[PDB]
Design an enzyme around this catalytic site. Structure first.
Site, PDB file in Angstrom:
ATOM      1  CG  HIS A  41      -0.439   0.273   2.546  1.00 44.04           C
ATOM      2  ND1 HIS A  41      -0.210  -0.622   3.335  1.00 44.04           N
ATOM      3  CD2 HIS A  41      -0.024   1.301   3.139  1.00 44.04           C
ATOM      4  CE1 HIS A  41       0.270   0.046   4.465  1.00 44.04           C
ATOM      5  NE2 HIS A  41       0.390   1.182   4.331  1.00 44.04           N
ATOM      6  N   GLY A 143       3.050   5.579  10.314  1.00 42.72           N
ATOM      7  CA  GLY A 143       4.316   5.471   9.795  1.00 42.72           C
ATOM      8  C   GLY A 143       5.067   3.976  10.228  1.00 42.72           C
ATOM      9  CB  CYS A 145       3.255   0.211   7.404  1.00 39.00           C
ATOM     10  SG  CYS A 145       1.510   0.113   7.983  1.00 39.00           S
TER      11      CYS A 145
HETATM   12  C1  LIG Z   1       1.171   1.957   8.149  1.00 34.53           C
HETATM   13  O1  LIG Z   1       1.924   2.787   8.503  1.00 34.53           O
HETATM   14  C2  LIG Z   1      -0.553   2.008   8.915  1.00 34.53           C
HETATM   15  C3  LIG Z   1      -0.137   1.733  10.266  1.00 34.53           C
HETATM   16  C4  LIG Z   1      -1.400   1.896  11.232  1.00 34.53           C
HETATM   17  C5  LIG Z   1      -1.514   3.521  11.450  1.00 34.53           C
HETATM   18  C6  LIG Z   1      -1.865   3.604  12.945  1.00 34.53           C
HETATM   19  N1  LIG Z   1      -1.640   2.180  13.608  1.00 34.53           N
HETATM   20  C7  LIG Z   1      -1.306   1.223  12.350  1.00 34.53           C
HETATM   21  O2  LIG Z   1      -1.016   0.121  12.725  1.00 34.53           O
HETATM   22  N2  LIG Z   1      -1.563   1.695   8.243  1.00 34.53           N
HETATM   23  C8  LIG Z   1      -2.448   2.214   7.809  1.00 34.53           C
HETATM   24  O3  LIG Z   1      -2.771   3.437   8.072  1.00 34.53           O
HETATM   25  C9  LIG Z   1      -3.517   1.432   7.124  1.00 34.53           C
HETATM   26  C10 LIG Z   1      -3.618   1.616   5.719  1.00 34.53           C
HETATM   27  C11 LIG Z   1      -3.900   0.653   4.703  1.00 34.53           C
HETATM   28  C12 LIG Z   1      -5.754   0.329   5.097  1.00 34.53           C
HETATM   29  C13 LIG Z   1      -3.566  -0.839   4.756  1.00 34.53           C
HETATM   30  C14 LIG Z   1      -3.821   1.002   3.283  1.00 34.53           C
HETATM   31  N3  LIG Z   1      -4.831   1.916   7.577  1.00 34.53           N
HETATM   32  C15 LIG Z   1      -5.183   1.802   8.998  1.00 34.53           C
HETATM   33  O4  LIG Z   1      -4.281   1.043   9.710  1.00 34.53           O
HETATM   34  O5  LIG Z   1      -6.553   2.181   9.238  1.00 34.53           O
HETATM   35  C16 LIG Z   1      -6.776   2.412  10.859  1.00 34.53           C
HETATM   36  C17 LIG Z   1      -6.100   3.516  11.584  1.00 34.53           C
HETATM   37  C18 LIG Z   1      -5.398   4.464  10.901  1.00 34.53           C
HETATM   38  C19 LIG Z   1      -4.713   5.263  11.424  1.00 34.53           C
HETATM   39  C20 LIG Z   1      -4.986   5.564  12.837  1.00 34.53           C
HETATM   40  C21 LIG Z   1      -5.683   4.600  13.600  1.00 34.53           C
HETATM   41  C22 LIG Z   1      -6.361   3.688  12.670  1.00 34.53           C
END
Ligand SMILES: *[C@H](O)[C@H](C[C@@H]1CCNC1=O)NC(=O)[C@H](CC(C)(C)C)NC(=O)OCc1ccccc1
Ligand SMILES: *[C@H](O)[C@H](C[C@@H]1CCNC1=O)NC(=O)[C@H](CC(C)(C)C)NC(=O)OCc1ccccc1
Lengths: 306, 306
Positions: A41, A143, A145
């Site tokens: 992603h 950040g 991921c």
């Molecule tokens: C990648 O860095 C990120 C890690 C998330 C961000 C907050 N806690 C985590 O583990 N992943 C995401 O933002 C993903 C993106 C995809 C849907 C895979 C494209 N989205 C996500 O985790 O949404 C839920 C979320 C986002 C931000 C804060 C709390 C919850």
């Protein structure tokens, strides 16, 4: 003596962590030999992320769109391809810090160490268990991921997890290093939710053995039970069933303490039905299920890693 | 989101760990530049260890008595000297992996990461707090002496602890890296005991703020209290007193959550007097006091280290 939730030394993994930026998205990658692995992603933008088609999105990409930062040395991308939910970015430099490694997939109930990273820089290390519902109770911010989870066996790093997302209950979901999700999740912003969990019964018993080894004995009793009568109690308290293989795994800890596995089950039964009555076990007022029998033997014996 | 007891990445420390053997004693040493630091009781044998005279024991030693193992490369000792309860073994090779570093001494209530090692090989990493009684609740077996505790600030490793011994309650005692014990302990086999501990009040409040940030709100209330009326409650539950400086440290977490420090104190008061009533805070059924305000801000914001 003493018992702590303990992570593996993270040095071998720290030297593999890099920063991957494509467009407006920055996340972490794992650099092994001449390939950088990262969540697919990264090729997305905030409106791509509602319901994307990653194959369509990837054919539109160029090698030079991928900025790979290994500390303060750049990395030139010379090829790319998608494997399930991860990207494989082939670079013109092999990582001279590549440890010997394996890509393994773990079982719910198993533990691993997570090296949390932001912008390719390690932030902290901690231990996680893969829950029965294929989530992990982690600590992940925006950040993070592409941070990975791993175990170390002598000198070999077995990578088992790559971070992708957070679910609505505050738990975390990701893939193995071949890009396949743990559990029924997708790397899309949809109405996804964890689903019902259970307590890892064999791990609780292992932790009770860790307690006896460390001098916590108050929960012990003269009583016993059968595997079947234990499992009717386990069912009622949302513990998962105990198999004969679980009993076999607990053999060594049974031998070392002189407490038969089915006698510890009787102790667990009373703890479930009576609670702890204001007392603690290994500094916890809850029954802990994120230590495997292996974890207990490792820590209560002193195994190292080179 | 999520909150985990998290250690610093251990890579910079792993590259400093060596094995020191003198006579029948093997323990760990810390190799920085051309000096290896280790606990001075390595020069002892099992009958020396009842009541030794280390100055008498050390003049009887020769450089070649000290076998220093850096992985599988030997290290030639070319000088030795004692500094308080540590030994400084000067070797003919400077460690090319020496990070930038400082020797600091920490305050009770402060946390650090411990890299547990055996035979010069790192085994695991975990977070500890220095208790008010100058002990630490660690996980240490025979051979773990000379393992160090540390914090990392950007790229600089601040070493604060070296392991020496276990007390009768299963807790651990050691020195700073200048060889001075934390607390009223000696590196002799005598009737030594920990002495009475207290709960680190400012850390509990920090952890309650970590909980609010992560969505645990049930313990919040409309009530307030004064610092003085809180501290009479703290006294009765063996919590240590809360100062205005503690209130000031908690300011940022107060600002971020919109919960005034004295209002969180009122929440803590009720938790102390009523218990939790079968509920949990951040996966714990106990009030946790081994997270500092800094630890909470670091994890709930994402600071890294290069
Ligand atoms: C990648 O860095 C990120 C890690 C998330 C961000 C907050 N806690 C985590 O583990 N992943 C995401 O933002 C993903 C993106 C995809 C849907 C895979 C494209 N989205 C996500 O985790 O949404 C839920 C979320 C986002 C931000 C804060 C709390 C919850
Ligand atoms: C050094 O490797 C060792 C570390 C101890 C061993 C068990 N847990 C530990 O933390 N330190 C000692 O053995 C010290 C030696 C000196 C008194 C400093 C000379 N002794 C000690 O810790 O005695 C208590 C003990 C020993 C062994 C097992 C349990 C308790």
């Amino acid at each position: 003596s003493g018992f702590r939730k303990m992570a593996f030394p993270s040095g071998k993994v720290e030297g593999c962590m890099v920063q991957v930026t494509c467009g407006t998205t920055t996340l972490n990658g794992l650099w092994l030999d001449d390939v950088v692995y990262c969540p697919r992603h990264v090729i997305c933008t905030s409106e791509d992320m509602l319901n994307p088609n990653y194959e369509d999105l990837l054919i539109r990409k160029s090698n030079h769109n991928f900025l790979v930062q290994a500390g303060n040395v750049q990395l030139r991308v010379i090829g790319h391809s998608m494997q399930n939910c991860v990207l494989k970015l082939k670079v013109d430099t092999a990582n001279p810090k590549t440890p010997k490694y394996k890509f393994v997939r773990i079982q719910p109930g198993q533990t691993f160490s997570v090296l949390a990273c932001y912008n390719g820089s390690p932030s902290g290390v901690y231990q996680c268990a893969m829950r029965p519902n294929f989530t992990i109770k982690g600590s992940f911010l925006n950040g993070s991921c592409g941070s990975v989870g791993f175990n170390i066996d002598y000198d070999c790093v077995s990578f088992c997890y790559m971070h992708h997302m957070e679910l609505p209950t505050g738990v975390h979901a990701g893939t193995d290093l071949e890009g396949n999700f743990y559990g029924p999740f997708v790397d899309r912003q949809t109405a996804q939710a964890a689903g019902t969990d259970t307590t890892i019964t064999v791990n609780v018993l292992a932790w009770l053995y860790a307690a006896v080894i460390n001098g916590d004995r108050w929960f012990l009793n003269r009583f016993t039970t059968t595997l079947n009568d234990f499992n009717l109690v386990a069912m009622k308290y949302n513990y998962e069933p105990l198999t004969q293989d679980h009993v076999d795994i607990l053999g060594p800890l049974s031998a070392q303490t002189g407490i038969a596995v089915l006698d510890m089950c009787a102790s667990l039964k009373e703890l479930l039905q009576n609670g702890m009555n204001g007392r603690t076990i290994l500094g916890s007022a809850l029954l802990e299920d994120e230590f495997t029998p292996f974890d207990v033997v490792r820590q209560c014996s002193g195994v190292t890693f080179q």
